[PDB]
C-alpha cells in the first residue's frame, strides 16, 4: 500500500480499475479510523487547481448523518487521497443478502434515514445519483446508521477515458434513464432499494441481460410478491416509487411527507 504523512493503511476495502480504498488508523491517535480512497494522478483527466479544490470544498460541505463524510483531501507525488468517514458495517448489499430479507420495521428505519439524506440533497439541487445498496454503507452492525457513498469519483477528478467508461447499474436505474429525465429517477431508485430490502432482490433481477432489458422496457406495473405482507402504507409508498411514468411517480414533496416514511421520527 501507500505510505502517508498522517495515517497507517491497513486492510484493502475496495478496488477499482484505477483506485483502491484502504482502511486506516491515524498515526498518533489510533482510535481515529478512516477509509482512504487512493487514485494515481496519471489516471486522471488533468484539471484547474481552481476547479478541483472548488469541487473538494463542495464535497466536504455535503455533511449529513446519513452521508459518508469527506473529511480531508491530501496528495503526494503520485496520488490523490480522499479521506472519508469509515463505516464499519460494510455495504447495505451484503447486509440484505446475508439476511435474505429485512422485516418491514427495519426497512422503515432505513428508508427514513435514506430519505432524510435525500431531502437534504434535494434542497441543494444535488441529484441524478447511482443509488444502490452497494453504494450505501453501515455505520456499524450494531443498530446501523446507513451512509450514502460516492463510489465513482467524478466531475473535476474524472478519468481521461470518461467517454469510454460505463455508468449506472441497470437493476437500479429508472427506466426513463436507460431510455431526457429529471431527478425523479432517484425516487425510482429508492423504490428498488426498499423492494430489494423486503423481498430480497430488485424487481428486475434476471438470469440474463435480454431478460433484464425486456423488463426495463416493459409497461407492466411491478407486481409485489405476496409475502411478506406489508402495511397498506408501505405498499402505497412502494407502488408509487416504482411507477414507470415519472409524471405519474410520487413527488419529492409527497415522498418526504408520506406517512410510512414519517419524517417526524
Ligand atoms: N476503488 C474503488 C471502489 N470502491 C469505492 O469507491 C469505495 C469503497 C469503500 C468505501 C468506504 C468508505 C467508508 N467506509 C467503508 N467501509 C467499509 C467497510 C467494510 C467493507 N467491506 C467488508 C466486507 O468485505 C468487503 C469490504 C466495505 C466498506 N468503505 C468508499 C468507497
Q: What is the DSSP string of 74-139?
A: EE-SSEEEEEEE--TT-BHHHHHHHTS---HHHHHHHHHHHHHHHHHHHHTT-------GGGEEES
Residue nearest to atom 22 of ligand 1 (CA): 90
Cis amide linkage into residue 23, ω under 30° from 0: no
Q: What residues contact residue 196 under an 8 Å CB cut-off, 6+ apart? A: 96, 133, 202
**Cα–Cα distance, 63 to 65 (Å, whole number):** 7
Cell numbers for 153: 469519483
Structure resolution in Å? 2.5
Q: Is 25 annotated as a binding residue?
A: no
Round to whole Å and give the CA distance between 77 and 169: 34
| Pick among 3.30.200.20, 3.30.9.10, 1.10.110.30, 3.40.50.2000: CATH of 1-86 | 3.30.200.20
Tell me which residue has its CA closest to atom 19 in ligand 1: 90
Three-state DSSP class for 160? coil
Instruction: Give nearest CA residue, ligand 1 atom 7.
Output: 151
The atom number, within ligand 1, closest to the CA of 20 reads: 1
Q: Quote the ligand 1 centre to 21 CA distance (angstroms).
A: 7
User: Taking each helix axis from N to C terminus, what angle separates 104-123 and 185-199, rounded to the nearest 10 degrees?
Assistant: 170
Q: Whose CA is nearest to atom 20 of ligand 1?
A: 90
- 117, 127 in Cβ contact below 8 A? no
Ligand 1 neighbour 193 (Cβ under 6 A)? no
The residue from 78, 130, 186, 245 that is catalytic is 130
From residue 245, give the alpha-carbon distance in Å to each of 172, 181, 212. Answer: 16, 11, 18
| Catalytic (active site) residue 76 | no
Cell readout for 80 is 490523490
Annotated binding residue at 21? Answer: yes
Q: Which technique was used to obtain these atomic coordinates?
A: X-ray
- Establish whether 23 is an annotated binding residue: no
CA dihedral 110, 112, 115, 117 (to 10 degrees): -80
* Region 87-265: CATH code: 1.10.510.10
What is the domain partition of the chain in residue ranges? 1-86, 87-265
| CB neighbour list of residue 75: distance below 8 Å, 6 or more residues apart | 41, 81
151 lines ligand 1 (CB under 6 A): yes
Q: Is 261 annotated as a binding residue?
A: no
Of 77, 62, 176, nearest to 121 by C-alpha is: 62
User: Which burial class, exposed, middle or buried, applies to 242 when counting CB atoms under 10 A from its CB (0-12, 13-18, 19+)?
Assistant: buried
Cell of 169: 447499474
Please tell me if the CB atom of residue 13 comes closer than 6 angstroms to any atom of ligand 1: yes
Residue 20 beta carbon below 6 angstroms from any ligand 1 atom: yes
Amino acid at each position: 500500500p501507500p505510505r502517508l504523512d498522517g495515517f497507517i493503511l491497513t486492510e484493502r476495502l475496495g478496488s477499482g480499475t484505477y483506485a483502491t480504498v484502504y482502511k486506516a488508523y491515524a498515526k498518533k491517535d489510533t482510535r481515529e479510523v478512516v477509509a482512504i480512497k487512493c487514485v494515481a494522478k496519471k489516471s486522471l483527466n488533468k484539471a484547474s487547481v481552481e476547479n478541483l479544490l472548488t469541487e473538494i470544498e463542495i464535497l466536504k460541505g455535503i455533511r449529513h448523518p446519513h452521508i459518508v463524510q469527506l473529511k480531508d483531501f491530501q496528495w503526494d507525488s503520485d496520488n490523490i487521497y480522499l479521506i472519508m468517514e469509515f463505516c464499519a458495517g460494510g455495504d447495505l448489499s451484503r447486509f440484505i443478502h446475508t439476511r435474505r430479507i429485512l422485516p418491514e420495521k427495519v426497512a422503515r428505519v432505513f428508508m427514513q434515514q435514506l430519505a432524510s439524506a435525500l431531502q437534504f440533497l434535494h434542497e441543494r439541487n444535488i441529484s441524478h445519483l447511482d443509488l444502490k445498496p452497494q453504494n450505501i454503507l453501515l455505520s456499524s452492525l450494531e443498530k446501523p446508521h446507513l451512509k450514502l457513498a460516492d463510489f465513482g469519483f467524478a466531475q473535476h477528478m474524472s478519468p481521461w477515458d470518461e467517454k469510454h467508461v460505463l455508468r449506472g447499474s441497470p437493476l437500479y436505474m429508472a427506466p426513463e434513464m436507460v431510455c431526457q429525465y429529471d431527478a425523479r429517477v432517484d425516487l425510482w431508485s429508492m423504490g428498488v432499494i426498499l423492494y430489494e430490502a423486503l423481498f430480497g432482490q430488485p424487481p428486475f433481477a434476471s438470469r440474463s441481460f435480454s431478460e433484464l432489458e425486456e423488463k426495463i422496457r416493459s409497461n407492466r406495473v411491478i407486481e409485489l410478491p405476496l409475502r411478506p405482507l406489508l402495511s397498506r402504507d408501505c405498499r402505497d409508498l412502494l407502488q408509487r416509487l416504482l411507477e414507470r411514468d415519472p409524471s405519474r411517480r410520487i413527488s419529492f414533496q409527497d415522498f418526504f411527507a408520506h406517512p410510512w416514511v414519517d419524517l417526524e421520527h
